[PDB]
T-cell receptor
Framework: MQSVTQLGSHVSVSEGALVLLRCNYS??????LFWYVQYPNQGLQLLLK??????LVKGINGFEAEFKKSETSFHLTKPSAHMSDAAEYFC?????????????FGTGTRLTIIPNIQNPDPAVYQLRDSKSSDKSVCLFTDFDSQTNVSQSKDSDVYITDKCVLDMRSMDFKSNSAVAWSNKSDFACANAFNNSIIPEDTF | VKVTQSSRYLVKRTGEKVFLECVQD?????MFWYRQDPGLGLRLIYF???????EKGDIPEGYSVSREKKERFSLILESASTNQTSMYLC????????????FGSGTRLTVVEDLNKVFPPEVAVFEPSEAEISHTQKATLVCLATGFFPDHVELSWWVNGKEVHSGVCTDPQPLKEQPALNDSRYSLSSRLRVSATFWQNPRNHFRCQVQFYGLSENDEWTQDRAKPVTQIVSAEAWGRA
């Protein structure tokens, strides 16, 4: 049991695509292997465990991993990525069978799923509220996964990463990115300009 | 069948000594302390296979550990340092039983170099664009939470009493208000989206809530701003015709 490597610490797959997370170990003695998932606001949880009862292990939330002694690997797969599956994933190895003596974990792998934005119309809107603070913010929403939101050129203007909301009952998902300043000479013709799509409402 | 760790967030100061509790109600034999750091995964500091017994993990340096009772297992950092800033994770297992490790929730520690520069977030909400209603039949509110240090916010949306799953997105990670400042204040955005109608109703209350996790009661200061404790800062909102 003394070791584990997780080759490839970040992974990005389109929703519907194969998830495949790697894990190899080094072991002086017969190893029992494990897989932990860590969804955003949460502690670790057990996806599946290898206790030498059988070679192809079935797990939870759709997952599966084949122990190959041949090549010293317990790689984890799900053939079809859900959005739900975005998490840090952890390999671990023990010397005793149920997980009872200590566990050595791997460095981990953060799985990212990219949504299938079916009917995108990119738009950049402007929102205001002057109750908490006189400020103005510009929403780059409804654009589509190909597109990415580059960081500011101006020091005193604040632009955040993209992000996917999903509205259960309407089968609808949409990307969105947020931009703001206090600066008087900033507007949303200024704001997102860097590799933005060439057909967005204003 | 549960493992708590007394604090869920903590602010401590370069040098200050630090106690972290860990406690289980399962009469369990082995307990462990790991730290989780980005890139490095989980790293075992120290462990205990019975009462009174400590043993060192892969990274025990400038850590110390106590097991007076079977329920308990405290971690101690002596002089706290900046790279002992991290996410600290307690686990317990039984030796007889076949049921494996039981993790705690975590304790996030931030160590800060010769000063407490901890401010709650101010939290402005913003209301959806005229164009968006018309164009997309949808309506996106935006909540910014701003001017906080360290990164200890937990941002939630609330509609008409009960919290909301759906149509939400908060920034995985915040951004620095000033990438100049070494210990720069932080800020975070979230979005809640809904149907046009739902917004066009002043029977619909929209609150954006942020919980800071800052200083505690026995912490020492009195400079000319509020005590930056573990308060909730909301902004609120109301639909329109």
């Amino acid at each position: 049991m003394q070791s584990v490597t997780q080759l490839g610490s970040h992974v990005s797959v389109s929703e519907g695509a194969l998830v495949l997370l790697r894990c190899n170990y080094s072991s002086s003695v017969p190893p029992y292997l494990f897989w932990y998932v860590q969804y955003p606001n949460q502690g670790l949880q057990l996806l599946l465990k290898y206790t030498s009862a059988a070679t192809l292990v079935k797990g939870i939330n759709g997952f599966e991993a084949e122990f190959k002694k041949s090549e010293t690997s317990f790689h984890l797969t799900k053939p079809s990525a859900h959005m739900s599956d975005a998490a840090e994933y952890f390999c671990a190895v023990s010397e005793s069978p149920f997980g009872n003596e200590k566990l050595t974990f791997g460095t981990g792998t953060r799985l990212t799923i990219i949504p299938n934005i079916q009917n995108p119309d990119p738009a950049v809107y402007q929102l205001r509220d002057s109750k908490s603070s006189d400020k103005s913010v510009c929403l780059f929403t409804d654009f589509d996964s190909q597109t990415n939101v580059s960081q500011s050129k101006d020091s005193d203007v604040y632009i955040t990463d993209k992000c996917v909301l999903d509205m259960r009952s309407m089968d609808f998902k949409s990307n969105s990115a947020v931009a703001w300043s206090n600066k008087s000479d900033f507007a949303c013709a200024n704001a997102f300009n860097n590799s933005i799509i060439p057909e967005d409402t204003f | 069948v549960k493992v708590t760790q007394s604090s869920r967030y903590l602010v401590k100061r370069t040098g200050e000594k630090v106690f972290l509790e860990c406690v289980q109600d399962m009469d369990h034999e082995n307990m462990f302390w790991y730290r989780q750091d980005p890139g490095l995964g989980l790293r075992l500091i120290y462990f205990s296979y019975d009462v009174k017994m400590k043993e060192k993990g892969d990274i025990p340096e400038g850590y110390s550990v106590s097991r007076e009772k079977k329920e308990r297992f405290s971690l101690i950092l002596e002089s706290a340092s900046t790279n002992q800033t991290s996410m600290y994770l307690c686990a317990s297992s039984s030796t007889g039983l076949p049921y494996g490790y039981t993790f705690g929730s975590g304790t996030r520690l931030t160590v800060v170099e010769d000063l407490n520069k901890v401010f709650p977030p101010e939290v402005a909400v913003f209301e959806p664009s005229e164009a968006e209603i018309s164009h997309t039949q949808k309506a996106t509110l935006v909540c910014l939470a701003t001017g906080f240090f360290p990164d200890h916010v937990e941002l939630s949306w609330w509609v008409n009493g009960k919290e909301v799953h759906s149509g939400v997105c908060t920034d995985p990670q915040p951004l620095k208000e000033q990438p100049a400042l070494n210990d720069s204040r932080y800020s975070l955005s979230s979005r809640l989206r809904v149907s046009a109608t739902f917004w066009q109703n002043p029977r619909n209350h929209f609150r954006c809530q942020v919980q800071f996790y800052g200083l505690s009661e026995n912490d020492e200061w009195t400079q000319d701003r509020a005590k930056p404790v573990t308060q909730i800062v909301s902004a609120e909102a109301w639909g329109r015709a």
